[PDB]
Amino acid sequence: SRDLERLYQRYFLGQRRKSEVVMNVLDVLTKLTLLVLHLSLASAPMDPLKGILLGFFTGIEVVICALVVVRKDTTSHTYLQYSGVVTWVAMTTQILAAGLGYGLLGDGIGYVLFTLFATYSMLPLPLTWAILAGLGTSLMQVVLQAVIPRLAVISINQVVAQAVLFMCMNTAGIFISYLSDRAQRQAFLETRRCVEARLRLETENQRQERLVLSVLPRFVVLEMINDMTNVEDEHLQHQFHRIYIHRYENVSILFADVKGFTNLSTTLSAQELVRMLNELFARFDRLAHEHHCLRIKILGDCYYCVSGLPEPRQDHAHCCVEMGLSMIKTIRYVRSRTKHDVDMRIGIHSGSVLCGVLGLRKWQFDVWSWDVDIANKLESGGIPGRIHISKATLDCLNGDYNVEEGHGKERNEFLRKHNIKRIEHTIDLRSGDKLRREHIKPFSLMFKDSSLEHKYSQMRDEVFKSNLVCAFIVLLFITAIQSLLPSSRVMPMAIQFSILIMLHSALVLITTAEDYKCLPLVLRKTCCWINETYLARNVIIFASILINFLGAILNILWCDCSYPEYFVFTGVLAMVTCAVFLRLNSVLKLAVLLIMIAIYALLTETIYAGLFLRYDNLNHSGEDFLGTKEASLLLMAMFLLAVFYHGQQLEYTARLDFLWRVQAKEEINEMKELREHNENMLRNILPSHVARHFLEKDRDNEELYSQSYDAVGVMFASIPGFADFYSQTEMNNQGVECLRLLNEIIADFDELLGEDRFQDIEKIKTIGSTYMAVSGLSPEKWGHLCALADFSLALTESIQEINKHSFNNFELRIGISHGSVVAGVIGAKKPQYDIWGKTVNLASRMDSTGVSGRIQVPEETYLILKDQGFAFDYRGEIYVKGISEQEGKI
Amino acid sequence: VYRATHRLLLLGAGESGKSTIVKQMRILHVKATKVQDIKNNLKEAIETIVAAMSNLVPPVELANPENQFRVDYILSVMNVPDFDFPPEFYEHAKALWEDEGVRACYERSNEYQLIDCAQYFLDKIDVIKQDDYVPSDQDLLRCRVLTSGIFETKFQVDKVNFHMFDVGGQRDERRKWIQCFNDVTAIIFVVASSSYNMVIREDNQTNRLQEALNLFKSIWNNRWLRTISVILFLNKQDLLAEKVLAGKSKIEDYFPEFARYTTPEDATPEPGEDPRVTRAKYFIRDEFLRISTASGDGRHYCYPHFTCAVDTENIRRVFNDCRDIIQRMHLRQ
């Protein structure tokens, strides 16, 4: 992916650019410091030729400093790549100024060591660019020896060693550049993957929740969500299954039933009837949305609003009467094409309702009260095509609407009714912006929490074996650097060199014991254990650092050797080893780094000062001793500053990425928990296959979801005594305790439904105090009818038990039937699983025309359980048909 | 402040004295209709005594036959829906009450159904005959009023609020109890300990004490009262003591286990107490603790108390003890 990798380069360019901002600032200090000491050395002013080139060089570094800031603000980063080239050429040119003209007469070879290391450490140039930039300085060092032949006169040999001194910078420099870039690739790759997973899970969470919120309004879904989270420690003290009901006031209830349903039911089959029903009811849902209703349920051929239930409205019944006029208009519209005569009747009443859910399975929003019963009776009144505006509503709307005298006498005269990308950039940008002053220490870059730093320390160094290899090569090169350098005790220094080169190899084999499979596992475990804990690796990293330093100084201690500046660069060749060791902490690196300079400061003062003096007089030149020890610590200063800032920036980036990874993981965990809660609620609301079909696309593309089944049993269970039991006094809040008892009954039924004995039976819905369940919907034999019969008997037993526990008598009317049904969703916007057919109406009629406490059943297709009452002869709704009743199994 | 308030309800069988307990508690810490109810109670008592003169299978001997027109007058006005209140009727009632045959008929009141406050108002015919006085609070507590629905009385003692819940006790009214079984601090079960001799007026077969025991069994094992920790309030202790002191009726005559039962080692050493009353009260209490403990799980506990709802000192002492119990219980250890 060239587009993604280029996108990484734009991100990678900025982080490396932050390093060169201080290094260009570092360079301008280098020019003035060398210029100042040259001014202070001689009372007479320096050569005017000397000042001009450094003036260009000390001025261009200011320009690059003022050029990187503007490009960082700019969205493009082309000049950031150029800035590394502009900086490299500026310092690389410095060599020509010294070699041919005057330039920076101080230092010399050591200064080239500083920049040639620089162009592999802080320059945002890619790895391929670094080799070209590094080789340019190295090949120009070859030009330096030609333009300064007296340097070759100083050392006829060791000129190859001088190139070797500059060869290991390329060898060690690519190691830092490649590993640091590789680690940056993983950090960018990981932060790109984590955001991809977070966005993937958020869309699913919002899509899953959008279906749950389609039904079950928010003001009860919030209560359910709070309940399932277990907000308190435990709810070990519970006596009731709890309810989610609330009382509302100043609402209006509509109703509608098809007058001639049975006449047209026999004319056409089930599929066409379902099609017309869905068309009418979907247009009706659109009308309800237009007129501020919210439908509660669709039972058979019935449809009813609640006006202003979740939010109050001053004109609450106005919306109901307007949408009722819309009901009439839509019925007239569908009356076109001379198809049928499905005209209906509408009844409206206003009052107080109790809204909530009952039971544990297939939760559905409903309303129970006495006033909804008044609305139901007003609808059942009659005169299809006309509304009922009984006194509780006529005085509600206004006196501005003219309505007739109302019904004469159609319903029972009881109770006196009185009718009348850029995100990822801001993803990275907000990480640094928030963490400018936050959990990380402003300078030590340490997390405030001890555990957060500790869980960082346990992370293993994946390049520890490769990083320790780098320390071996540089220590091997200083051995080759010094081996050809002359000394008095050539053999005695080699014996110590052999020990030191073996000491590093001793740690090499120990730290590569895991790499050495042939070596025993116990040794391999120690290698893993070394990198497992940060402190055990820190001492080894410190240890391997020392061996490079001991090897780099022991040669000088042998000297009592006429080239004292070349032995100094070996310490510079040891300071890179600290920069190589990326993982070790920054402040710990400064403490060990401060040891290197302090020892060299002690070895560059009066001790071995005479050895520097004999070098001064031999070279002579123009006061070049300012390029000697006077500049030896000057080189050490810039090298130390560069190495320290490299370590600091590397640790800064690493800590930032770790902290953001932790934050993203926490967000992912929280979102996963929310997903689990939503999944639980959705599973409780709707069946599996229906929920899966409605979750993805084609929720509204397919207006009708339906399926035809052949062998399905249908059962109804009614409690006629609850209407007499129900009463709205003041002691019970408004009947809330009666609804609590009803919820207890329904919850007992639902819990009984969960037994393994009843696997083929699924609860469809509850109609007020009626319980409806079907048998054998999922084919996976007439055993499911037997299961349904056992379910009815168990329901009778449960109602008897709860009657015993309470202090009143309740009786169940059970109606069963068997046949072919059609199961599907009738509302695309609000998915409510439902079934239709002729056996459903037969079951409802058999339940309605029955005696309490007894089960009425059609033609007995089973001989397993014996029935009785064959001579019952119930006319029903279709035609007269005599069939039996249902006793127990025996 | 809803949690601070305590909700208490008085669940008990019929004629258990819970309403009397509520009245006494109300007058402890805070018209002509009451006079009318006293008159009606005395009226019902005298009419039932006159009817039971002849209704019982074992005939009760009468007084001097000349003093019989009074009986005919009481029988005649009893059928009248609107009973008269003339001085002549009160003279008739006093004449019956002083008669020895009527006294013997009253002594057999356990055979038929009669209010327990009959003799208190029957001793008050002379003062009620003038129909010009206001009965005292003690006479107010003797009134017999049927409780149909459930009633609440707000309470406040020592800066803490209490809630009262008076409910009916008849088998027809037991279906309304579920309306207030939620978030209740404790149940104050009241049992008429002296009703071991009589029977309930709804079936006329089961003993009142047996019905109360069945009610307590139903309440204790109720699935919606698993952790409620009922409090037991034995009532009518004075009536039980009087009945057991008379010797006409015995607890053994209706409960065979009583004869073998012995007084427990732990007892309340009341100075004005007899071994018989102690053994009777402890037999009843041990029956109730047995039925409670057989199903005991440690979730809820019962604290039996002996109470006489007529006198106010026993009421206030038992109420103080129960208030300490309810405070410790609201502590929710």
Ligand SMILES: Nc1nc2c(ncn2[C@@H]2O[C@H](COP(=O)(O)OP(=O)(O)OP(O)(O)=S)[C@@H](O)[C@H]2O)c(=O)[nH]1
């Ligand atoms: N002598 C005596 N009479 C009592 C005692 N306790 C209550 N009574 C009387 O018994 C009568 C019945 O008490 P009451 O409060 O009406 O029972 P209840 O439980 O409320 O009656 P119900 O609603 O269940 S039908 C009252 O008139 C009262 O005066 C008592 O301890 N001793």
Ligand SMILES: C=C[C@@]1(C)CC(=O)[C@]2(O)[C@@]3(C)[C@@H](O)CCC(C)(C)[C@@H]3[C@H](O)[C@H](OC(C)=O)[C@@]2(C)O1
């Ligand atoms: C349980 C509630 C109670 C007592 C009052 C009530 O609002 C109902 O639930 C309605 C009216 C009400 O829920 C609206 C739908 C429907 C189906 C019309 C119910 C039935 O008529 C219930 O009666 C039966 C017997 O199912 C009924 C009337 O019973």
Ligand SMILES: [Mg+2]
């Ligand atoms: Mg009462």
